[PDB]
Design a protein around this ligand. Structure first.
Ligand SMILES: *[C@@H]1O[C@H](CO)[C@@H](O)[C@H](O)[C@H]1NC(C)=O
Ligand SMILES: *[C@@H]1O[C@H](CO)[C@@H](O)[C@H](O)[C@H]1NC(C)=O
Lengths: 49, 49
């Protein structure tokens, strides 16, 4: 309800508490180069070299 | 040669996982465990404990 001589002033107030969730880190992982590809095989390791 | 008879034998193999019926002339050693070794079970090879 806009007018050029009218204003609205709040009388009361409410105190609200809100929640915000933010990821910070993820799991750390490691991979074995040889045991994933040529697991326990001298021939396959030689070929992978 | 070319008009002379030839005797032809063709063998079809089937590995599967059922008990083996035809095997090679390889000799069997004694079994050891709790040790990283190379094994050969009915033609299936590998490395492990
Ligand atoms: C704007 O204010 C004037 C007085 O200065 C008034 O006459 C006019 O009606 C107002 N405008 C509206 C849309 O009410
Ligand atoms: C503001 O709201 C509270 C909660 O309803 C009420 O107790 C209080 O009287 C209100 N204040 C005014 C000035 O209306």
């Amino acid at each position: 309800a806009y007018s050029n001589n009218s204003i609205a002033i709040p009388t009361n107030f409410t105190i609200s508490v809100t929640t915000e969730i933010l990821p910070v880190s993820m799991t750390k992982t490691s991979v074995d180069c040889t045991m994933y590809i040529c697991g326990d095989s001298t021939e396959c390791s030689n070929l992978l070299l | 040669v070319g008009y002379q008879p030839y005797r032809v034998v063709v063998l079809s193999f089937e590995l599967l996982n059922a008990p083996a019926t035809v095997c090679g002339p390889k000799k069997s050693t004694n079994l050891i465990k709790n040790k990283c070794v190379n094994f050969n079970f009915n033609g299936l090879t590998g490395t492990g404990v």
